[PDB]
Design a protein around this ligand. Sequence first.
Ligand SMILES: O[C@H]1C[C@H]2CC[C@@H](C1)N2Cc1ccccc1
Ligand SMILES: O[C@H]1C[C@H]2CC[C@@H](C1)N2Cc1ccccc1
Lengths: 299, 304
Amino acid sequence: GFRKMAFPSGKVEGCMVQVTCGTTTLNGLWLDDVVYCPRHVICTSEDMLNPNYEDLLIRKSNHNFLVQAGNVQLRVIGHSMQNCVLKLKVDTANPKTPKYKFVRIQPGQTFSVLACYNGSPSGVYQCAMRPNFTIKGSFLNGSCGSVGFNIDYDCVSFCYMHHMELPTGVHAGTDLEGNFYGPFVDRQTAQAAGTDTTITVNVLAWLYAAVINGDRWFLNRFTTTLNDFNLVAMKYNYEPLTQDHVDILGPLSAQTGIAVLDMCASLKELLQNGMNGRTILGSALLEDEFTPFDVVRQC
Amino acid sequence: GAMSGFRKMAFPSGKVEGCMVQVTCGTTTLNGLWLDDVVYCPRHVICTSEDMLNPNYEDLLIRKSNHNFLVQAGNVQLRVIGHSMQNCVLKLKVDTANPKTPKYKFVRIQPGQTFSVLACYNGSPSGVYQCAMRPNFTIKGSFLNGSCGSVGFNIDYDCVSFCYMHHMELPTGVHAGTDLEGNFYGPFVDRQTAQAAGTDTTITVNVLAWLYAAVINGDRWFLNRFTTTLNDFNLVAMKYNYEPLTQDHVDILGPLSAQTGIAVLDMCASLKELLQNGMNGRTILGSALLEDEFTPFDVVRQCS
Ligand SMILES: O[C@H]1C[C@H]2CC[C@@H](C1)N2Cc1ccccc1
Ligand SMILES: O[C@H]1C[C@H]2CC[C@@H](C1)N2Cc1ccccc1
């Protein structure tokens, strides 16, 4: 048994609020007496072509910002900008503020997203940062202002905020400090996600998860070099394996007795020959949205 | 379009997290669902490992008193004031009503319907996932054996419809459980005996709703211009371990058929061709697999 789960979203639900600036309405993250939201809420329909956000911001009054928490409206008493997130100083601290951090993740790492609309949570799903720096998801997977997070024993690590949905069924955003993931801008302009690749380090972790649960038909007696595998994996649009990734898989290699370059040879043959009608953990396709720690932590 | 690259989402688990408690009977410990002044949990918490082969739950329960049960919610102990058995769920009455109690109902679901499960170990929520109710009356979940007492639920307008409680691991790695009234789904007993779930099939009505969702989003590569009779389709689908489509299922897909202009039996012929050819690289709504855990109810509502 092995099914992908998202973190319990209870701690994040208590922070979701509705932020409206003029005609634009989106989701905001209410922590203490500050509401975090994408800065493009201050954009006009007619001005999100090359906006000069800080000049538009220093002239919008606090009363332009409508903040709703359920049926309580929070009075905005201040506003400042950090990169691409808008900070709204409000007169009320959120009593449901959890123990939290602001962290930045890197491609291949996983987190949960609390999909929200008009500040009210609709659903939660588990996802990974694609190598192209996008997050797979539809317009029905949350609108602007939805946040991505991890939970580490009572502490919520906020790592992502939805900013825009790309036409290819993926969305892109920033961390909670305003820094985009990937080569994207918060402008209505022609933006496309680059050619996506498979997160190789996650596939091996998922293959380790199959070993730990007794699915070991794919294990072979061969070993490969790190680059001979990388030369093959890249040909199949699999994100190259670094020595960092080999190190992160260390505990799974020691616990299963399968060296990383041993499992790499198994994955290598899987790429060149397919699975030949067989399955792994009940799936006929290789899963790449399970980090090594996701496996260490569930298995 | 609207649903491009769509991902299955579980319902926000906040309202259920506030109900999870830890129930302990002697050395056995598992999860309980605290609603008002009643804690619901699997009745096999009163079993030891030796009792589980042939447990006499009436004999075991009649020997228990309120002080034999330890119920903990975070750091507070809940004194039990009453205990009764309803089928396969234990109901422990406590002196404290759950102030965190959400709006809730008890509902029994059918195979094919979907819900969220909050996986909990010793009363603490670990993770949440979205699953469907398999035709063989199991669910494919992920555990550690402590997940007994984890509940399945849906949320509609902040009212939490509880529909499942986990009881068993079956030897095939899937899970079996009851509704919140204690009635098992399928031919399973809360007994650690030789139980085998019948071979699982694919929820055909969910796949057809998934394919209708793709057409609404402009994903039409899999469509063919053929139609089929309902019997000819069922004759083919069952050989691929797909569920026989009933006239009820055809009626449920009505609004989807009318919204796209593709007859249900026409869609069935396209699915029949997908089964003989496979996808093998091509994707539908961004997924390289035929999704069978998204119900027509969810498709119709998200595509008005
Ligand atoms: O944006 C994604 C992450 C990185 C950068 C480009 C591509 C896609 N990745 C590298 C790569 C190249 C060849 C083969 C496999 C991976
Ligand atoms: O328990 C599940 C529901 C029903 C009855 C057994 C099986 C699985 N289903 C029938 C069936 C079998 C093969 C092919 C198509 C349908």
